[PDB]
């Protein structure tokens, strides 16, 4: 009824969500040339800026994950923007995909943080200058937070895109139900829809960047 835009799309009985997930990278052409067209120029510029702004903080071991993280911040971003197209199915609105993006990443990061550096890894569970009478619970709280963080990532992205698209759709329905009534009110609701669309573009970009930044900071912590 209302969640028609989030049901796994199928066409002619075929699960066409796979094509929608595969499509974004088709919008990033590459080239072995030296001077190239405008699209690849700007896109290489953006990848350069993003890599610089993200990886810089990491040490020599962290930056090996660079290829990963940048790719991440691209994929998500493109997907999000492709969502804002009419009648489009946004695969980030699915909890499944975000779980599969988060649990492996944060997982492996905590894994490598435990394999080596195990001493300080178990010591990060305790801040530096903690007095004695409050030691035990300060461990368990960190345990819960760490052991849940991937859930936070996945849901924060999933439901955010969900609510964005759902609200845009509801205000659209409202404008529809105000088409046959006061035209100035129809224009006011339309303008609110325009502002919300702009905000949704911004929230797309920002949610991509924030998912990336959070995973990156976890990596930094466990390196």
């Amino acid at each position: 009824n209302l969640f028609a835009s989030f049901i796994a799309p199928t066409i002619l009985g075929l699960p066409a969500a796979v094509l929608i997930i595969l499509f974004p990278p088709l919008l990033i052409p590459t080239s072995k040339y030296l001077i190239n067209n405008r699209l690849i120029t700007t896109q290489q510029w953006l990848i350069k800026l993003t890599s610089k702004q993200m990886m810089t903080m990491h040490n020599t071991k962290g930056r090996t994950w660079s290829l990963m993280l940048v790719s991440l911040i691209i994929f998500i971003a493109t997907t999000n923007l492709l969502g804002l197209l009419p009648h489009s199915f946004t695969p980030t609105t699915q909890l499944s995909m975000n779980l599969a993006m988060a649990i492996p990443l944060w997982a492996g990061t905590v894994i490598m943080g435990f394999r080596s550096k195990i001493k300080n890894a178990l010591a990060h569970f305790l801040p530096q200058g903690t007095p004695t009478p409050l030691i035990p619970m300060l461990v368990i709280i960190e345990t819960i937070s760490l052991l849940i963080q991937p859930m936070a990532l996945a849901v924060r992205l999933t439901a955010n895109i969900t609510a964005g698209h759902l609200l845009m759709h509801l205000i659209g329905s409202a404008t529809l139900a105000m088409s046959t009534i006061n035209l100035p009110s129809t224009l006011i609701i339309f303008t609110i829809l325009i502002l919300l669309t702009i905000l949704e573009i911004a929230v797309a970009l920002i949610q991509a960047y924030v998912f990336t930044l959070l995973v990156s900071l976890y990596l930094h912590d466990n390196t």
Binding site: F3, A152, V155, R156, A159, A163, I206, Q207, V210
Partner: protein, 75 residues
């Protein structure tokens, strides 16, 4: 039904929890105003943090709405 009724009540309740995100964004953007009024040369950089700050405040707010719908429709 009493079930449907309690779904409505719990939905409104879980919705209450968005006041936290409201005040959080209020604080974040107020601090951004102050910090920019102090050291305007850093405006760009400051703005970044602001967005991030915002991006986590709304985060918690989202969870509230989540349960809301996850009670209103999924349950």
């Amino acid at each position: 039904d009493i079930d449907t009724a309690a779904k409505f009540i719990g939905a409104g309740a879980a919705t209450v929890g968005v006041a936290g995100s409201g005040a959080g964004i209020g604080t974040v953007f107020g601090s951004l105003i102050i910090g920019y009024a102090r050291n305007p040369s850093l405006k760009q950089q400051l703005f970044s943090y602001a967005i991030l700050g915002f991006a986590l405040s709304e985060a918690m707010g989202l969870f509230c709405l989540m349960v809301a719908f996850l009670i209103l429709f999924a349950m």
